[PDB]
């Protein structure tokens, strides 16, 4: 069970971002009603390898299940179209948009993609 550190707002995100100065960060946008989002938790973030690859990565996670104002705000700010969507910021706080994962992805593929930051 990867241990994410929940965030709810755009500020909480930037806050967590400054904290993780120097480490690579991953943001996972999740929602209970989203099956794909559930499949991601059950079959990928659970995989040994995947967890190994994320060992030195700061784990952030926004649960947008309520789809409230704050939620919509955060999604709009990150230009997120739907879930599951996963973002990556280099250890210098820079997000790599072309690297985000949209939709379900199996552990083998995810782990690979994760280890391309070398």
């Amino acid at each position: 069970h990867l241990n994410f550190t929940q965030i709810k707002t755009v500020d909480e995100l930037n806050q967590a971002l400054v904290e993780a100065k120097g480490k690579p960060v991953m943001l996972d946008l999740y929602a209970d009603w989203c099956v794909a989002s559930k499949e991601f938790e059950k079959y990928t973030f659970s995989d040994p390898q995947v967890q190994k690859a994320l060992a030195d990565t700061v784990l952030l996670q926004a649960n947008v299940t309520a789809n409230d104002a704050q939620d919509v705000a955060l999604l709009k700010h990150l230009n997120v179209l739907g879930l599951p969507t996963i973002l990556f910021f280099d250890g210098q706080g820079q997000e790599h948009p072309q690297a985000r994962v949209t939709g379900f992805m199996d552990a083998e593929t995810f782990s690979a993609h994760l280890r391309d930051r070398q």
Binding site: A31, W33, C34, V35, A36, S37, K38, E39, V64, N67, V72, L75, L81, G82, L83, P84, F88, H96, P97, Q98, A99, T102, G103, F104, H113, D116, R117
Partner: protein, 121 residues
């Protein structure tokens, strides 16, 4: 190998549109192949108008290990609405939600349909 290298925007996945002719309104969604709408998520709410109860058509069944079965719509969705009365500036609030087969969930969408005035009878 490159860390920096599929799903279309919601309005491109579910192309919404409507057409009215007096008491007759037609709600319509062009549903992109590979995507589908959740029947249980559609909501039609009138604002300054009186609408006849709307009957949702029979769609297909989708399944997944979590919620089991769910009625969904593919290709296209046509929803006939009967407008008994509508004041000037009356509107129809339409909410729906869909997902993609490849495993992608779009959040709920709400469109406001401008209804044309329609008197009692």
């Amino acid at each position: 190998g490159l860390f920096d290298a599929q799903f279309v925007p919601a309005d491109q996945a579910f192309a919404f549109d409507f057409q009215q002719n007096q008491h007759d309104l037609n709600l319509t969604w062009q549903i992109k192949d590979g995507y589908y709408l959740y029947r249980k998520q559609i909501r039609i709410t009138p604002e300054h108008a009186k609408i006849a109860d709307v009957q949702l058509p029979q769609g297909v069944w989708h399944e997944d290990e979590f919620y089991g079965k769910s009625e969904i719509y593919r290709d296209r969705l046509t929803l006939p609405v009967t407008i008994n009365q509508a004041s000037a500036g009356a509107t129809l609030t339409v909410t729906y939600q869909g997902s993609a087969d490849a495993g992608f969930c779009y959040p709920p969408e709400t469109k406001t349909v401008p209804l044309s005035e329609v008197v009692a009878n």
